[PDB]
């Protein structure tokens, strides 16, 4: 009882190609559902919508969510990373739990224990990929509350189905500690950079191609003017040159002007929006396949559901204006990827003849074609780290559409609850999570200096990423990783 089972370790070390980030926080865990496993559905919610129809069980267990970068990186360390490195990726995980206390409603209950274990077998439903709240707090002096575990399973409307499922040795702990080590499956480096060149401008400007394109389909003005004339694709007509590789897939998003007077005065917010359907439930496409948020020189427009939107500190839950939230732009990937609010391109819709003129049509969506290249969606200091891959017969490019690292074996879910003894009871403790990161340096010989990240030096009421006069920590703006530049 009079023994301390762990110290407070919070720091970061910069060693070679590695970065070691240790984040300790304090948690407080109450009793969920009064130790009960309770069926939930839309029917207690009322089920006013079909596409919102769900079913599942809400369970007393909690869980530790460190899955967001703002847990493991100070706004400085995030700056020291994204400015100097092409890529990073997690290597190891080291988790600890210690200095357990149990309370009774307030005095010490010294004989109570705390059930905590990990699922390394990935047997339970995995909720950590949907970017929920409950994460460790970004600022170390904040005590956080543990979120409740609960899951969903198959249903027909509100009712369950026969194929649905329902759901462990748990080390019981106030002088005990709990630790475990987790190893990440090999994942490619997150690409924190922007290409110097655009896909369509990979050619040498000063020389011709040896390939020919068809310039003239007719001779002149009149009847029976048909002729064929050919030309060398070169500097004069860069657009028509033969190309080896082509931009990645596109699924069009409805364009939205941030200046509202330009925006249409109609309710296009839901019906207008693109989506997908699964078992006759149309679901919104969010954030969707990575696509540049906007064309060159238009920063006011953004895709309707395409990009990630973060709330500012203190922003309310419902009906907050566009000045209470943060909105993230993909403008870096405009090099290799189509714009969401633009079509992929045009095709031919018919055969021409001397009778009928040629026709074209717009491509509002394009799947994969051999020779497509693309960039994925960036991660943010406020953004998620990893997501779990579904277990399926096949998949393509498992990287999670919200950004981060897709894995068939993500960090295991760490479950915790108070052992029931009922008497009002709650526990606290300490958690020190430690992740080891690998770095990919940059050998770039580019002469002119890079775009970096800076703190604007000008007199201000408060400092960014600091505490206001009441001590409310604030992250003023989303920070992406892509600043340094690479060749294409």
């Amino acid at each position, epitope marked *: 009882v009079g023994s301390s089972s762990g110290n407070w370790h919070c720091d970061s070390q910069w060693l070679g190609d590695r970065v070691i980030t240790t984040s300790t926080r304090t948690w407080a865990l109450p009793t969920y559902n009064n130790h009960l496993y309770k069926q939930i559905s839309n029917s207690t919610s009322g089920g006013s919508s079909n596409d919102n129809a769900y079913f599942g069980y809400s369970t007393p267990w909690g869980y530790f969510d460190f899955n967001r970068f703002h847990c493991h990186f100070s706004p400085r360390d995030w700056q020291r990373l994204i400015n100097n490195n092409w890529g990073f990726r997690p290597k190891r995980l080291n988790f600890k739990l210690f200095n357990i206390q149990v309370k009774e409603v307030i005095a010490n209950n010294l004989t109570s224990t705390v059930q905590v274990f990990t699922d390394s077998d990935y047997q339970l439903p995995y909720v950590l990929g949907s970017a929920h709240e409950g994460c460790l707090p970004p600022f170390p002096a904040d005590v956080f509350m543990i979120p409740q575990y609960g899951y969903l399973t198959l249903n027909d409307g509100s009712q369950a189905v026969g194929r649905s499922s329902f759901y462990f040795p748990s080390q019981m702990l106030t002088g005990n500690n709990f630790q475990f080590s987790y190893e990440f499956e090999n994942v490619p480096f997150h690409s924190s950079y922007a290409h110097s060149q655009s896909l369509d401008r990979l050619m040498n400007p000063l020389i011709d191609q040896y390939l020919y394109y068809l310039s003239k389909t007719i001779n002149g003005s009149g009847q029976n003017q048909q002729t064929l004339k050919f030309s060398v694709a070169g500097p004069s007509n860069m657009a028509v040159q033969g190309r080896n590789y082509i931009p990645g897939p596109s699924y069009r998003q409805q364009r939205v002007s941030t200046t509202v007077t330009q925006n249409n005065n109609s309710e296009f917010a839901w019906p207008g929006a693109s989506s997908w359907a699964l078992n006759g439930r149309n679901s919104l496409m969010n954030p969707g396949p990575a696509m540049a948020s906007h064309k060159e*020189g238009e920063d006011r427009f953004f895709p309707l559901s395409g990009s990630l939107i973060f709330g500012k500190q203190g922003t309310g839950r419902d009906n907050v204006d566009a000045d209470k939230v943060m909105i993230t732009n993909e403008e870096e990937i405009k090099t290799t990827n189509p714009v969401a609010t633009e079509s992929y391109g045009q095709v031919a819709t018919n055969h021409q003849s001397a009778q009928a003129q040629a026709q074209t049509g717009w491509v509002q969506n394009q799947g994969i074609l051999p020779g497509m290249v693309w960039q994925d969606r960036d991660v943010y200091l406020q953004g998620p780290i990893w997501a779990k891959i579904p277990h399926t017969d096949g998949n393509f490019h498992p990287s999670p559409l919200m950004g981060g690292f897709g894995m068939k074996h993500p960090p295991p879910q760490i479950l915790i609850k108070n052992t029931p003894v009922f008497i009002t009871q709650y526990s606290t403790g300490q958690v020190s999570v430690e992740i080891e990161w690998e770095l990919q340096k940059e050998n770039s010989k580019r002469w002119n200096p890079e775009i970096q990240y800076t703190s*604007n*030096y*000008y007199k*201000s*009421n408060n400092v960014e990423f600091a505490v206001n006069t009441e001590g409310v920590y604030s992250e003023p703006r989303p920070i992406g990783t892509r600043y340094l530049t690479r060749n294409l």
Partner: antibody
Framework: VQLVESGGGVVQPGRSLRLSCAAS????????FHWVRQAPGKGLEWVAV????????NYADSVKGRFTISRDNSKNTLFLQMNSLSADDTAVYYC????????????????????????WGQGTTVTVSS | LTQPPSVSGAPGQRVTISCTGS?????????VHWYQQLPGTAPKLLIY???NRPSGVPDRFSGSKSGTSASLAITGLQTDDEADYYC???????????FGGGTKLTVLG
């Protein structure tokens, strides 16, 4: 210290008229000059900005290529000659002199950023209409 | 750079005008220069620099810069203070200065 204008008139669409600004009472060379156009009911619009000795000139977008700027130092005059006027250009034109600088870039002291226009002229009405 | 279409205040009070700005405009730290013009007369520079009043300017006329949006607070409103105010700043992407949309202060007396 005075800054005037002249050359205004009734152009009608499609034709050019030079617009000149003569100035005395201050050193002509040591100050950078601006032209700023004001529609009757619309906020001040900055037409052009020319540096001292006229080495570098950077137009606004709307007028790019259909205007030109010439500054003759010897006679202490600022000359703005335009071309291919449409009826969207009918408005007053103020001859300005930039001095004050946006703070952090004052050391670089470029031709641009001297958007501070301490004093400027009486303006002249150039009306483009058929 | 956008200003309120109209601002209105009574004599003997505190009127404020504020021009919000973009990153290309005020994010860079570029100074925001305020102008006034009595109607149908040549505009006069008012607050040269971020918050400085030049020689020959009333003390009550004061303005500042914070974030991307500068503000101008006139104290002890006078009849002579009814006129059009204009917020200018340099815009980086444009590469030329952008004046505001214009404002007319209304003395309600």
């Amino acid at each position: 210290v005075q800054l005037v204008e002249s050359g205004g008139g009734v152009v009608q669409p499609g034709r050019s008229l030079r617009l000149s600004c003569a100035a005395s009472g201050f050193s002509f060379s040591s100050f950078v000059f601006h032209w700023v156009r004001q529609a009757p009911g619309k906020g001040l619009e900055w037409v052009a900005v020319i540096s001292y000795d006229g080495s570098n000139k950077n137009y606004a977008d709307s007028v790019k290529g259909r205007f030109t700027i010439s500054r003759d130092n010897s006679k202490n005059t600022l000359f703005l000659q335009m071309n291919s006027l449409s009826a969207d250009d009918t408005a007053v034109y103020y001859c300005a002199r930039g001095a004050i600088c946006s703070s952090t870039t004052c050391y670089l002291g470029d031709s641009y950023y001297f958007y501070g226009m301490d004093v400027w002229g009486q303006g002249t009405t150039v009306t483009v209409s058929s | 750079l956008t200003q309120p279409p109209s601002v209105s205040g009574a004599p003997g009070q505190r009127v404020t005008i504020s021009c919000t700005g973009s990153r290309s405009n005020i994010g860079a730290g570029y100074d925001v220069h305020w102008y006034q013009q009595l109607p149908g007369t040549a505009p006069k520079l008012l607050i040269y620099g971020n918050s400085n009043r030049p020689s020959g300017v009333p003390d009550r006329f004061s303005g500042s810069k914070s974030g991307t949006s500068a503000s101008l607070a006139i104290t002890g409103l006078q009849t002579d203070d009814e006129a059009d105010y204009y917020c200018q700043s340099y815009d980086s992407s444009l590469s030329g200065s952008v004046f505001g949309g214009g404002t007319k202060l209304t003395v309600l007396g």
